[PDB]
């Protein structure tokens, strides 16, 4: 009426508002169940195994205390957002058949002071009264955040009080007879306080990784139960699982959902893998850009892309070419020359490091260039990279003269001096410098704590007298002449590759057809 006015306001202000699960609420005959058990979780077999052994050890084991095995009464889940930690918490609540207090780390600190510590007290009291139980403080990032060095904030004050109340309350389990288990879930685990991670409060922390290929296929197989699929769903699932690298489980669920929605949006019975691939592209990048309108400039862009591709395909030592595109469907980007990825080599049984070993094999052929019974040597191998970089500019300067050179072909050519500088100076395999005493003419002697490098003090005039610049320029001049002759001899195949990629359905050519075009056409007359 008068003062328990304010005190009732207080004990309503400071009562635990955590939702209690798995106990029967006597209001209407109901009891809040989650509706998820340990079979709705895909691709986390390690974590489900740990959780299963813990929920057996906590529920009348007599087989773990048979061996003195106590339960770690502080558990933390951490990992990037979208990995399904709250779903694991829901499944644990379901299969634990004990009281489960769900709460968040963002409800304690509020209007007045002393409210957060009192709410934590109320929660832990009604928990310890009903032992054994489980508590789940989701997003502890707002409560167990590290104590800063300054900042005069009453919210900071309430955070400090809530934090130390939390600390002493999980210290309130000093008599081990209390069997309360507490779980935290976060993705900013680095910003937690070091006192929490101390043994006796939060002993175990768990990481949830982004799913690998097997876990991805498992999640897809699960979320696809109850939807129409075209053909054998196993191949479709294999492809869409090894095509969405780096995705989270929420992303895959949403992917299947919107695939079904689009399947019934345009009146098609089943889902075919082209549609799901289109979906993953549109979800990675966004809207699809339109092609380039026809011009007398699209013809020259086609020609320079064709010369670049035909020179990539005759460079001995490069990985297989997969396609040559003229569209690319992105904004800012233009034509492209693509190479086989990890998936295709995995399907082909090739070494991961094969571009390195192609420097020493002796009798083979990769796209349209053959090497026979004598290897390259990381000099010829790397210095052969300079012809595909001078091929656009060579096509221009050969068909039009200097007046027809463009900015379209200047960024490749502006990256050749670095490669030739490595071949001459840093690689240490230049035919000229092999016969010298073992002196190291390119030494830098480390960085300091301000981050500055220093040079070998003996090196007065080494780069001027060893003649590095003139040697790099000899390499580049020879490369330019090589590319000129190459573009002059493969004139017809360049013309034909350009013509064929211009008149293609998706404006794409495949590597095998490119290779065949280069092979069938005879050489020109110079």
């Amino acid at each position: 009426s008068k003062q328990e006015k304010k005190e009732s306001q207080w004990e309503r202000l400071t009562s635990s508002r955590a939702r209690e699960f798995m106990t029967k609420d006597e209001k209407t005959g109901k009891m809040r169940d989650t509706g998820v058990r340990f079979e709705d979780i895909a691709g986390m077999e390690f974590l489900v195994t740990e959780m299963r052994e813990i929920v057996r050890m906590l529920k009348g084991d007599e087989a773990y205390k048979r061996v003195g095995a106590k339960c770690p009464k502080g558990i933390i889940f951490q990992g990037p957002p979208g990995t399904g930690k709250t779903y694991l918490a829901r499944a644990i609540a379901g299969e634990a058949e004990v009281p489960f207090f769900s709460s968040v780390g963002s409800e304690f600190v509020e209007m007045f002071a002393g409210v957060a510590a009192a709410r934590v007290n109320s929660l832990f009291y009604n928990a310890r009264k009903k032992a054994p139980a489980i508590i789940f403080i989701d997003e502890i990032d707002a409560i167990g955040r590290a104590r800063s060095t300054l900042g005069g904030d009453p919210g900071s004050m309430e955070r400090e009080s809530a934090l130390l109340a939390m600390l002493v309350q999980m210290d309130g389990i000093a008599n081990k007879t209390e069997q309360v288990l507490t779980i935290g879930a976060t993705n900013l685990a680095q910003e937690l306080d070091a006192a929490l991670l101390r043994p006796g409060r939060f002993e175990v922390v768990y990481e949830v990784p982004q799913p690998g290929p097997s876990a991805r296929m498992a999640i897809l197989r699960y979320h696809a139960k109850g939807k129409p699929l075209e053909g054998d769903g196993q191949r479709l699932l294999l492809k869409t699982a090894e095509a969405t690298q780096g995705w989270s489980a929420a992303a895959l669920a949403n992917l299947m959902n919107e695939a079904a929605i689009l399947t019934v949006r345009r009146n098609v019975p089943a889902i075919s893998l082209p549609m799901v691939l289109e979906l993953v592209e549109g979800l990675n990048w966004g809207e699809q850009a339109p092609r380039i309108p026809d011009s007398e400039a699209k013809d020259r862009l086609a020609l320079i892309t064709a010369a670049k591709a035909v020179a990539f395909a005759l460079t001995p030592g490069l990985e297989p070419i997969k396609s040559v595109t003229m569209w690319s469907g992105r904004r800012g980007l233009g034509p492209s020359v693509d190479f086989i990825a990890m998936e295709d080599k995995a399907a082909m049984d090739m070494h991961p490091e094969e571009t390195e070993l192609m420097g020493w094999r002796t009798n083979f052929k990769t796209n349209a260039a053959v090497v026979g019974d004598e290897p390259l040597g990381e000099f010829a191998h790397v210095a052969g990279l300079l012809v595909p970089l001078y091929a656009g500019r060579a096509a221009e300067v050969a068909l039009f003269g200097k007046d027809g050179a463009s900015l379209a072909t200047a960024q490749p050519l502006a990256d050749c001096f670095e490669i030739a500088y490595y071949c001459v100076r840093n690689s240490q395999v230049h035919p000229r410098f092999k016969s010298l005493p073992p002196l190291h003419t390119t030494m830098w002697l480390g960085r300091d704590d301000a981050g500055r490098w220093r040079r070998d003090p003996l090196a007065i005039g080494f780069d001027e007298e060893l003649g590095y610049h003139k040697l790099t320029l000899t390499l580049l001049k020879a490369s330019w002449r090589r590319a000129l002759r190459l573009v002059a001899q493969r004139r017809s195949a360049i013309t034909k590759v350009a013509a064929e990629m211009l008149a293609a359905p998706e404006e794409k050519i495949t590597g095998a057809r490119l290779v065949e075009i280069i092979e069938s056409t005879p050489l020109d007359d110079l």
């Binding site: 390690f46 740990e50 052994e53 050890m57 087989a63 773990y64 048979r66 061996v67 003195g68 095995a69 106590k70 770690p72 300054l150 900042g151 005069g152 900071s156 004050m157 400090e160 043994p199 002993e203 175990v204 070494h351 490091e353 390195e356 070993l357 020493w360 094999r361 002796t362 290897p375 040597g377 990381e378 690689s427 240490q428 395999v429 035919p431 092999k434 016969s435 005493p437 073992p438 002196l439 190291h440 030494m443 002697l445 480390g446 960085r447 300091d448 704590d449 220093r454 040079r455 070998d456 003090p457 003996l458 007065i460 005039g461």
Partner: protein, 347 residues
């Protein structure tokens, strides 16, 4: 928790009051005959100024990380509780616990008990201790001539590191392990070494020769035109040694006792760097002549050391071509069964 410095989350009346009353009880009207306040902390810089003044808290004692037999002892004293291991070697179990603390040992044995219970057993055995790592973990692809080159390199380096007096012990010599394009000769790191010991001239020269050994083996077996740049870090280290003898230790007869280089440790990427001195062209050319002399002499000695052991070099490179990974024990055995000739030690 209480002894925090000033300007913290307070208005100088709550925290300051409690630590000032701590003071008044510690110093003001001292009658603490037999009383001792034994605080526990690991952030000893955060304690207030007036709280560590002479008299209040001066004795401050440090404890180090648990180590091999220390954590062995923490296991043993912890091993009086359960249906423990009756008697099994765990003194070398601590070798598999590098970088662990007491809390790590407690949590590890806890999880080991948990998995021993998961095994349906009632008692815990030794291997399930290793079973901690059970949970927290969760033709030829190479062409011939590359295999040959790397084998010859590693054979040359290991052979010359074997026949050189006072050099370390070979632990592992492997060529392209697990079909990963690489190779190395590993040496046994010893703690009997005391870095404050100085290095004589003969020891430094021996290290220079060992570093040039592998490149000289390549040049002698396969020809100059087939040398790769694979032996570049060895060349870098040989050049470091030859520039520090001349410009840090005054072992050049034409420069003299002048100091021009100074190693220095980083505030902890590499562990170290150097302080230099801007030289004229004369000083620098006179130092360069000496460095070149040292290096080409070391190269000649490495070439002779390999040439008078051609049969053991052949045996070692063939063993590497056939097995791809050998231990130090077998290196010794292969080298002795083929007539290896050690270098003389004049001292």
């Amino acid at each position: 928790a209480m002894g925090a410095a000033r300007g913290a989350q307070a208005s100088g009346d709550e925290s300051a009051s409690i630590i000032n009353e701590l003071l008044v009880q510690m110093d003001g009207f001292e009658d603490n005959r037999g009383i001792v306040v034994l605080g526990a902390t690991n952030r000893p810089g955060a304690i207030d100024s007036a709280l560590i003044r002479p008299g209040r808290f001066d004795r401050i004692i440090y404890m180090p990380l648990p180590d091999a037999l220390g954590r062995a002892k923490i296991m043993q004293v912890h091993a009086r509780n359960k249906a423990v291991d009756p008697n099994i070697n765990w003194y070398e179990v601590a070798r598999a616990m590098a970088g662990f603390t007491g809390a790590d040992v407690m949590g590890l044995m806890a999880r080991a008990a948990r998995m021993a219970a998961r095994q349906g057993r009632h008692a815990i055995t030794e291997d399930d201790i290793y079973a901690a790592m059970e949970n927290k973990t969760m033709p030829d692809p190479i062409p011939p001539q590359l295999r040959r080159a790397v084998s010859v390199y590693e054979a040359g380096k290991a052979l010359l590191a074997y026949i050189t007096p006072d050099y370390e012990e070979i632990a592992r010599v492997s060529v392209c392990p697990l079909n990963v394009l690489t190779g190395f000769t590993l040496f046994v790191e010893d703690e009997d070494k005391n870095v404050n010991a100085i290095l004589t001239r003969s020891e430094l020269e021996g290290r220079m020769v060992v570093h040039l050994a592998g490149r000289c083996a390549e040049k002698l077996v396969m020809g100059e035109g087939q040398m790769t740049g694979m032996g570049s870090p060895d060349l870098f280290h040989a050049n470091l040694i030859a520039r520090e003898m001349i410009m840090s230790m005054g072992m050049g007869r034409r420069t003299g006792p002048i100091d021009l280089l100074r190693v220095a440790a980083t505030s902890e990427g590499d562990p170290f760097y150097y302080h230099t001195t801007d030289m004229s062209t004369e000083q620098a050319r006179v130092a360069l002549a000496e460095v070149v002399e040292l290096l080409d002499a070391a190269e000649a000695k490495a070439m002779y050391g390999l040439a008078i052991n051609w049969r053991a070099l052949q045996a070692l490179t063939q063993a590497l071509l056939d097995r791809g990974t050998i231990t130090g024990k077998e290196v010794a055995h292969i080298l002795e069964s083929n007539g290896v000739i050690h270098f003389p030690d004049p001292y």
